[PDB]
Design an enzyme around this catalytic site. Sequence first.
Site, PDB file in Angstrom:
ATOM      1  N   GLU A  61       0.825  -1.202   0.000  1.00  0.00           N
ATOM      2  CA  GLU A  61       0.000   0.000   0.000  1.00  0.00           C
ATOM      3  C   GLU A  61       0.861   1.255   0.000  1.00  0.00           C
ATOM      4  O   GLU A  61       1.895   1.308   0.664  1.00  0.00           O
ATOM      5  CB  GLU A  61      -0.930   0.008   1.216  1.00  0.00           C
ATOM      6  CG  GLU A  61      -1.659   1.324   1.437  1.00  0.00           C
ATOM      7  CD  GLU A  61      -2.666   1.625   0.347  1.00  0.00           C
ATOM      8  OE1 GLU A  61      -3.013   2.812   0.167  1.00  0.00           O
ATOM      9  OE2 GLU A  61      -3.115   0.676  -0.329  1.00  0.00           O
ATOM     10  N   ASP A  89      -2.376  -5.229   1.042  1.00  0.00           N
ATOM     11  CA  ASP A  89      -1.654  -4.123   1.655  1.00  0.00           C
ATOM     12  C   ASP A  89      -0.249  -4.448   2.141  1.00  0.00           C
ATOM     13  O   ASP A  89       0.626  -3.578   2.130  1.00  0.00           O
ATOM     14  CB  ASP A  89      -2.508  -3.534   2.770  1.00  0.00           C
ATOM     15  CG  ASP A  89      -3.703  -2.768   2.238  1.00  0.00           C
ATOM     16  OD1 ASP A  89      -3.764  -2.507   1.017  1.00  0.00           O
ATOM     17  OD2 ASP A  89      -4.587  -2.423   3.042  1.00  0.00           O
TER      18      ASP A  89
HETATM   19  C1  LIG Z   1     -15.802   0.549  -1.382  1.00  0.00           C
HETATM   20  N1  LIG Z   1     -14.490   1.067  -0.916  1.00  0.00           N
HETATM   21  C2  LIG Z   1     -14.225   2.318  -0.513  1.00  0.00           C
HETATM   22  N2  LIG Z   1     -12.921   2.408  -0.164  1.00  0.00           N
HETATM   23  C3  LIG Z   1     -12.368   1.194  -0.354  1.00  0.00           C
HETATM   24  C4  LIG Z   1     -10.958   0.779  -0.108  1.00  0.00           C
HETATM   25  N3  LIG Z   1     -10.091   0.735  -1.154  1.00  0.00           N
HETATM   26  C5  LIG Z   1      -8.802   0.353  -0.996  1.00  0.00           C
HETATM   27  C6  LIG Z   1      -7.856   0.324  -2.161  1.00  0.00           C
HETATM   28  O1  LIG Z   1      -6.780  -0.306  -2.048  1.00  0.00           O
HETATM   29  O2  LIG Z   1      -8.167   0.942  -3.208  1.00  0.00           O
HETATM   30  C7  LIG Z   1      -8.346  -0.034   0.360  1.00  0.00           C
HETATM   31  O3  LIG Z   1      -7.067  -0.434   0.596  1.00  0.00           O
HETATM   32  C8  LIG Z   1      -9.350   0.036   1.445  1.00  0.00           C
HETATM   33  O4  LIG Z   1      -9.039  -0.267   2.619  1.00  0.00           O
HETATM   34  N4  LIG Z   1     -10.595   0.435   1.142  1.00  0.00           N
HETATM   35  C9  LIG Z   1     -13.364   0.354  -0.827  1.00  0.00           C
HETATM   36 MN   LIG Z   2      -7.315  -2.074   3.053  1.00  0.00          MN
HETATM   37 MN   LIG Z   3      -5.263  -1.433  -0.205  1.00  0.00          MN
END
Ligand SMILES: Cn1cnc(-c2nc(C(=O)O)c(O)c(=O)[nH]2)c1
Ligand SMILES: [Mn+2]
Ligand SMILES: [Mn+2]
Length: 180
Positions: A61, A89
């Site tokens: 991440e 992550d």
């Molecule tokens: C529906 N939604 C809204 N935000 C996310 C979300 N996206 C990610 C991502 O990697 O894009 C995360 O790591 C995460 O923890 N949450 C998912």
């Molecule tokens: Mn996440």
């Molecule tokens: Mn992520």
Amino acid sequence: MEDFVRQCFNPMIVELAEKAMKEYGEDPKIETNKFAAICTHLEVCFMYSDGGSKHRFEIIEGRDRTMAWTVVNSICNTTGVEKPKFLPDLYDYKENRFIEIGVTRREVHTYYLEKANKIKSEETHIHIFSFTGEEMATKADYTLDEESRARIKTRLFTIRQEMASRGLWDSFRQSERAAA
Ligand SMILES: Cn1cnc(-c2nc(C(=O)O)c(O)c(=O)[nH]2)c1
Ligand SMILES: [Mn+2]
Ligand SMILES: [Mn+2]
């Protein structure tokens, strides 16, 4: 709200949030809740990596998507591990597995089953944190020691208090319910 974010997190995290925001096409000045959530996810992810022996975790991440996928491929092609279908992550060189960190404002077990069915992996480990000091993990294996997990927990709550001290907590917890 924007001002809070910029004086609450460090510039290095703030900058990394702004990058990921514009990539999705999102304005960090209009969607300031999502701004704060990304800043938070980042921080939590960094504190979680901090938590192991020096060479333990690989941080997926925060990187650029293309570079992140290149990292994953390199792990899979070297450990034998099954490649995930979505971007995790972290990876754990001690427990030989990928990790997915979540930070939610609804239930730990609610967010868990939303993420698990989305990955469909008998190998990718899961770990969810909450703004209420609660945690859930695949097979109840929490990876880090008590002291480490407690620190992140503590911190998450300090942000929760901080927003609420300005009347931004309601709007912030509502927005995640407004997303799903
Ligand atoms: C529906 N939604 C809204 N935000 C996310 C979300 N996206 C990610 C991502 O990697 O894009 C995360 O790591 C995460 O923890 N949450 C998912
Ligand atoms: Mn996440
Ligand atoms: Mn992520």
